[PDB]
Design a protein around this ligand. Structure first.
Ligand SMILES: Nc1ccn([C@H]2C[C@H](O)[C@@H](COP(=O)(O)C(F)(F)P(=O)(O)OP(=O)(O)O)O2)c(=O)n1
Ligand code: NA
Ligand code: NA
Ligand code: NA
Length: 323
DNA sequence: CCGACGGCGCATCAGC
DNA sequence: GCTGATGCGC
DNA sequence: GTCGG
């Protein structure tokens, strides 16, 4: 419920962004995000820094910041950095996909501060950055679930057309049943591809380009594609969207699907459960741990269920994996 | 006090 | 031209 | 910045 502590969470999120994009302190970025998130879930309107400090992730300094915010309705440090031309410009440029803190700083140092300046300096942008600039606004839009379904329709159809033995699963928030998603993440496998066994990814990307669904490529190798797609349109045309496709060995596929469905909290919790049951699970495999902590060979996994069964957990519907 | 905090694929850079 | 590092975004 | 060994 935004209005509850929205001022605080907004404050912490802005601080997080400056740490990541300007100070290049990724661990402070994550600290602020963690604090913002735990506070976002706190079912009460916070009345003091001390009250917030009781939450894991909120420490001495953020408590102080909350006291200042509650007393004055702002934070001096944040007001200052907001009005800082160099800082605010660096922070802004990182909103372009492909421009990170390093590129943003370099651009701003040489007087390139706005999208207009970027537009004027194509020669100084790499391929990814040019695409990020081209679809700047579209990439910041969320994707309604209904469009995700139309997108899924196309992907599953074209994948099957290339080879009916491919298996493709759209993961991320969409598989968790979310009513909107930030992008589309497709996990792909094929019986012919295992850990102990190309063009499998290429043929799928190619077919999706052939029907004009994929419009641009950000990066592409033998196992990972990142690019851009658009649903077909006298109605207004759909925004361009980010799509990733990952080719994963068949024997590691379902660990992959589990992992890339998330959420992070759920993955963390399931990893914890697995441990106390004597198993180590990561993105790729689930392995038994010996009595001295030595990891055994990967266990056979032929479905998401197999994983749950190993750790004696009842199968959890993707829709029920927020925690 | 002081180290961990995720780490991997791909594009591109830096050094040789 | 090769190899490892870095930047970036998942 | 926060946590915890
Ligand atoms: N940087 C990352 C990100 C994700 N993942 C894996 C591990 C993650 O748990 C899993 C899902 O990512 P997610 O939960 O973050 C997300 F995308 F679905 P969400 O932002 O919540 O939703 P939405 O699309 O609406 O923005 O991918 C990862 O390994 N590394
Ligand atoms: Na705390
Ligand atoms: Na960026
Ligand atoms: Na960004």
């Amino acid at each position: 419920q935004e209005t509850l502590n929205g001022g605080i969470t907004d404050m912490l999120t802005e601080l997080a962004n400056f740490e990541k994009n300007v100070s290049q302190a990724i661990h402070k970025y994550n600290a602020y995000r963690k604090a913002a998130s735990v506070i976002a879930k706190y079912p009460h309107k916070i009345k003091s820094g001390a009250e917030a400090k009781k939450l894991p992730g909120v420490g001495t300094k953020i408590a102080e910041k909350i006291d200042e915010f509650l007393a004055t309705g702002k934070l001096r440090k944040l007001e200052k950095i907001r009005q800082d031309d160099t800082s605010s410009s660096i922070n802004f440029l990182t909103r372009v996909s492909g421009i990170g803190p390093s590129a943003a700083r370099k651009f701003v140092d040489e007087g390139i501060k706005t999208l207009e300046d970027l537009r004027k300096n194509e020669d100084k942008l790499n391929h990814h950055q040019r695409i990020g600039l081209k679809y700047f606004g579209d990439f910041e839009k969320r994707i309604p679930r209904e469009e995700m379904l139309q997108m899924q329709d196309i992907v599953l159809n074209e994948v099957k057309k290339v080879d009916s033995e491919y298996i493709a699963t759209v993961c991320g928030s969409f598989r968790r049943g979310a009513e909107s998603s930030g992008d589309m993440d497709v996990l792909l496998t094929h019986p012919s591809f295992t850990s102990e066994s190309p063009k499998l990814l290429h043929q799928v990307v190619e077919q999706l380009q052939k029907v004009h669904f994929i419009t641009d490529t950000l990066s592409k190798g033998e196992t990972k594609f990142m690019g851009v797609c658009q649903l077909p349109s006298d109605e207004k045309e759909y925004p361009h969207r980010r799509i990733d496709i990952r080719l994963i060995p068949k024997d590691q596929y379902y660990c992959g699907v589990l992992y890339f469905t998330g959420s992070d909290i759920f993955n963390k919790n399931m990893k914890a459960h697995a441990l106390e049951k004597g198993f180590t699970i990561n993105e790729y495999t689930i392995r038994p741990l010996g009595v001295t902590g030595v990891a055994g060979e990967p266990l056979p996994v032929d479905s998401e269920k197999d994983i749950f069964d190993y750790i004696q957990w009842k199968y959890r519907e993707p829709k029920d994996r927020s925690e």
